[PDB]
Write an enzyme that holds these catalytic residues in place. Sequence first.
Site, PDB file in Angstrom:
ATOM      1  N   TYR B 122     -28.807  24.965  11.869  1.00  0.00           N
ATOM      2  CA  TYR B 122     -29.240  23.641  11.446  1.00  0.00           C
ATOM      3  C   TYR B 122     -29.820  23.698  10.045  1.00  0.00           C
ATOM      4  CZ  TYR B 122     -31.305  19.059  11.331  1.00  0.00           C
ATOM      5  OH  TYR B 122     -31.637  17.772  10.984  1.00  0.00           O
ATOM      6  N   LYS B 126     -29.077  22.208   6.383  1.00  0.00           N
ATOM      7  CA  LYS B 126     -30.098  21.461   5.649  1.00  0.00           C
ATOM      8  C   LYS B 126     -30.264  21.989   4.230  1.00  0.00           C
ATOM      9  CE  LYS B 126     -31.839  18.413   6.677  1.00  0.00           C
ATOM     10  NZ  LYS B 126     -31.747  17.019   7.162  1.00  0.00           N
TER      11      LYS B 126
END
Lengths: 211, 216
Positions: B122, B126
């Site tokens: 994740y 990001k």
Amino acid sequence: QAKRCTVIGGSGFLGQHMVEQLLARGYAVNVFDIQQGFDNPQVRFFLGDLCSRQDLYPALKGVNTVFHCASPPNKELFYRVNYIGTKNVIETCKEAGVQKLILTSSASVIFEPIDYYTETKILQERAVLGANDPEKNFLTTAIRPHGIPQLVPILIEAARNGKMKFVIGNGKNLVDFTFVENVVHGHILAAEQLSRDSTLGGKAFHILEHH
Amino acid sequence: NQAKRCTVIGGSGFLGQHMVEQLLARGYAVNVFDIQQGFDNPQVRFFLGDLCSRQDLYPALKGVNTVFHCASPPPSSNNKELFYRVNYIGTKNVIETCKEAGVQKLILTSSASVIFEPIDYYTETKILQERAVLGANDPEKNFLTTAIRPHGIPQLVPILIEAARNGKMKFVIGNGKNLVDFTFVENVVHGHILAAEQLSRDSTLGGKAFHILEHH
């Protein structure tokens, strides 16, 4: 054995909490202030003016960290407490063989009109940061929480180099903390992280949020 | 006033919700690009579609001044390639559609954990998403970008950040009395907005990331 420390301003709003959090961590806290704000167990209280070495040294010999949080609620009233007495906090932190002085400054100082209270918090911080001395085993740090005026920094640039250092914690345990309690957890984490990395020495520090 | 038109990609989301409610209070026009219509209010033209589609997205952006991106999948999903879809490629499509419509500023809502450089795919997306966004700061083209890094949309959290010697750290001032009342989310919105109203005054903030200080 040397995990002993001392709070100047323990009778204040923040010192109160500082001690609180500090004892739970397993710490022989000593409190130094001018009054007795409240009673507490396992915390030898020392009373006296901070401008006086003579009323201060009794409170510092033995310990390896000093949390300086003192601040009154007026030039000389603001100058002597935050400047003159801090230079004495520096002078007798060395005598008493202290290794780690953590100053509690503010956030207004990042402004370079600035009030006089903040004229003395820059003077204070500089003093404290100027005195960083890894060679004589004396590491100093400043921490800038906002509040305890009407202009406050909301966001700070994070340099894209990774040039800026930052302090890491474990937010899974402090899920229930309050604003003041995060100001304390800040002071402590830097404190205990100074004990590893001398290159926090000399550095001011802002506090981040964590949901 | 055609400099107050602006769009909250991801505007149906929890953060996105508040983003549009506050931006209506200060007199902005707000389209909302998302997938569902979430929680609606008769002053918003809720577009919707796919974030990665040039053509779902362009009509949602044409005419507006400022784009507020905060369309991120739940980090709890752990659909690995979804994070790569939405955060990276989608954002690229955000970037170009923002240039393909001559959008003036773009505020990306980043992640405080992107400072960690055993990390979630994740966050890796990001970080991809921010280098892109911050890499499209063309002051000459007059397209200006920033990213704000909030914490709660988690083993390690950054508690303290070094304040620089002098000048090498930008910051956004607020008037810290009206927001002692604000909830955390309300302040985080007040953060992006102040960023935006300042990207106009100083082109210096472009290409720069920000964290959120503690207060109230």
